[PDB]
Amino acid sequence: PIQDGEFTFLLPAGRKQCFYQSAPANASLETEYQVIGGAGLDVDFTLESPQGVLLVSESRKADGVHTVEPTEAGDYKLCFDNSFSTISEKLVFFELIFD
Amino acid sequence: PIQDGEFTFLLPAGRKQCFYQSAPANASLETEYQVIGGAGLDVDFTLESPQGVLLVSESRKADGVHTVEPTEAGDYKLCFDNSFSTISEKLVFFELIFD
């Protein structure tokens, strides 16, 4: 594992939060997210490539694991969408990059 | 708090990591970071307003604490720049919004 991260955040009612993760070309990007506790239960998750290709789109999931291999050089975008929710949601995501 | 986040990540040599933090108007954005390890390990940090005003810009820091108050409505941009270094560095970053 050459790069790793843990991101824990409150996602307010009705809002979206994205993260920009730089990757080198020809690596493996491993990602895992989890809604914490019960509150909000689930989330809409998207993963976009550095060239803006939608790689993952899932609706109303509590958790998910997604690996990009091989990666292209640039910024991957991980987005969490809490649109229509009147309550905040606590999320954690993990990302690992392997040569 | 109305919103909190704690981010731990490896920032490789020659890379920059930016975070976007949504704030409502007339709130308090409190931020704190730490580079993990002994002496000689540091990072450049910038904090930009939603309209792109440079609010913080500091070079080769191991740590920093910054409050924006009052906030405007929009996404603050918080960047850790390791672009001018051969050493990867491990960062902890905290953000908090109070109404």
**Structure tokens of B12?**
């490789």
Taking the domains of chain B in order of start, what are their residue ranges?
1-99
In the chain, the amino acid numbered B41 is L
* Cα separation, A70 vs A67, whole angstroms: 9
3-state secondary structure of A21: strand
Tally of residues, chain A = 99
**Structure tokens of B76?**
């603050």
The contacts of residue A77 (CB under 8 Å, 6+ apart) are A18, A19, A20, A21, A46, A47, A48
Residues of A in contact with B8 (CB under 8 A): 5-6
Spatial contact of A14 and A86, defined as CB atoms under 8 Å apart: yes
Q: Do A8 and B10 touch (CB under 8 A)?
A: no
Q: Do A5 and B4 touch (CB under 8 A)?
A: no
**Structure tokens of A47?**
């993963």
Can you give the resolution of this entry in Å?
1.7
Q: Do B22 and A8 touch (CB under 8 A)?
A: no
Residues of A in contact with B10 (CB under 8 A): 2-5
Spatial contact of A79 and A17, defined as CB atoms under 8 Å apart: yes
